[PDB]
């Protein structure tokens, strides 16, 4: 038993070692490893699979094998090599689809990730990617999911050309149609990792050799210049197609109005600056058409609308579009947020914890160059204090800190204030102008530190 397992492991090690020393001459050993893998023992199956993974990654070329002794035998060698690689992959989907056995499946996922990270450029990558994404498309996080998404994320970062990323994006999009755009939120975060979008003495030479060396050097320089231009154009075209597939998936997700609207707006905000100007004007229409977790969704729409308008140079590109409809939506949405409860527990625009966007929308609102503090901020801040009647003090202190560090010198925000227009539903007090409410009641509250927070506000 144990002796037999040890003997098989030694045989695999010897065969693997011989392959590393002389890979071309020992192709039959790979078939022997497959026979060894056929052994009933689960542990021997794991070791044989790992050795096959180690053997394949060591002998696989760094280039893509062009399909069909110096050239003929190499072709037969490469054609022969592709056959085990296909057979090894064929076993991979068999064991993956077949899902003690859990450990073997985790190992099967592991070698799949290793092939993804290293053998992405190689042939059969379409099958390799399809098998891996099929595991992620499931409703529950299957084991090794963290490994696969990390491998996919790493490829998206390293892939400067974007051809491999385009293949994965297409496969991911196909799963979304199969899943009706209902997948884990981590899956949509893969599109955010696309680097293409985020980019925004001497040995002696004979008299004949010197002329050959000069002639090759001229070709290489000409090759490099043309390749650079072709690379720039191909990357640009790949970026366009990736945006086409990604945005069509996001818009489909918005149409279904599922629970993945959070990740869709995340991607839309991140990739909005990559899209055409004409689409920027029509982008806010879809955001503002969803007004009939409803409060949470409206928060995403107004925040993303702010982010899209926050793009640099919008002053030069006067697309207008009157984001005031989103402004009044945020102006009205604070009251239901104060009405419903919220819990941070303990240990989507850009983050989580809904209160975080609100201050984030407020701080980008403040960061707007002179767009506020024209007697409109005070009207907004009044209901901000009204909405501050509940929620943790650190949140309450945060919003009061925003007006504390505010450059505007208005001081009547927490007291009687100018006309509260724009949907009203509050004390207008028109034409008052008196430097003379909420902090008085805020002093009496469950946490003792709110009292001193109110005191520090009135003293400051």
């Amino acid at each position: 038993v144990k002796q037999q397992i040890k003997n098989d492991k030694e045989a695999l090690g010897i065969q693997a070692q011989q392959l590393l020393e002389e890979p071309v001459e020992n192709l039959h050993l790979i078939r022997n490893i497959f026979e060894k893998f056929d052994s009933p023992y689960i542990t021997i199956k794991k070791l044989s699979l790992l050795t096959l993974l180690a053997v394949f990654r060591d002998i696989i070329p760094g280039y893509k094998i062009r399909p069909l002794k110096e050239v003929a035998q190499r072709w037969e060698y490469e054609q022969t090599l592709l056959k085990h690689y296909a057979k090894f992959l064929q076993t991979l989907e068999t064991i993956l689809k077949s899902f003690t056995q859990l450990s073997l499946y985790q190992v099967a996922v592991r070698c799949c990730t290793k092939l993804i990270e290293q053998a992405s450029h190689f042939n059969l990558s379409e099958k390799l990617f399809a098998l891996a994404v099929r595991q992620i498309s499931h409703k529950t996080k299957r084991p090794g999911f963290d490994g696969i998404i990390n491998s996919l994320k790493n490829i998206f970062e390293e892939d400067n050309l974007g051809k491999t990323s385009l293949k994965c994006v297409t496969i991911l999009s196909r799963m979304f149609k199969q899943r009706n755009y209902d997948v884990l939120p981590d899956v949509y975060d893969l599109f955010l990792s696309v680097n293409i979008l985020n980019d925004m003495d001497l040995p002696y030479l004979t008299k004949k050799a010197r002329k050959n060396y000069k002639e090759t050097k001229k070709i290489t320089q000409e090759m490099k210049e043309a390749d650079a231009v072709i690379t720039a154009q191909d990357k640009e075209k790949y970026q366009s197609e990736i945006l086409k597939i990604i945005f069509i998936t996001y818009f489909k997700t918005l149409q279904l109005k599922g629970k993945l609207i959070g990740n869709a707006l995340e991607g839309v905000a991140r990739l909005s600056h990559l899209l055409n100007i004409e689409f920027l004007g029509d982008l806010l229409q879809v955001l503002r058409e969803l007004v009939m977790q409803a409060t949470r969704e409206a928060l995403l729409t107004v925040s993303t609308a702010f982010e899209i308008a926050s793009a640099q140079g919008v002053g030069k590109l006067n697309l207008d579009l009157d984001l005031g409809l989103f402004v009044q939506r945020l102006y009205k949405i604070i009251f239901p947020f104060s009405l419903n409860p919220d819990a941070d527990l303990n240990k989507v625009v850009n983050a989580t914890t809904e209160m975080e966007m609100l201050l984030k929308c407020f701080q980008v609102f403040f960061f707007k160059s002179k767009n506020i503090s024209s007697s409109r901020l005070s009207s907004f801040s009044k209901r901000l204090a009204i909405a501050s009647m509940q929620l943790p003090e650190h949140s309450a202190s945060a919003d009061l800190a925003l007006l504390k560090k505010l450059l505007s010198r208005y001081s009547k925000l927490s007291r009687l204030l100018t006309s509260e227009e724009q949907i009203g539903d509050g004390i207008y007090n028109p034409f008052i102008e008196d430097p003379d409410y909420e902090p008085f009641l805020l002093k009496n509250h469950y946490s003792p530190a709110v009292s001193q927070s109110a005191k520090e506000l009135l003293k400051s």
Partner: peptide, 15 residues
């Protein structure tokens, strides 16, 4: 229930 079994078409590219 996740099979990627997915024809003839045409792409109008000429004037």
């Amino acid at each position: 229930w996740n099979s990627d079994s997915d024809e003839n078409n045409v792409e109008i590219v000429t004037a």
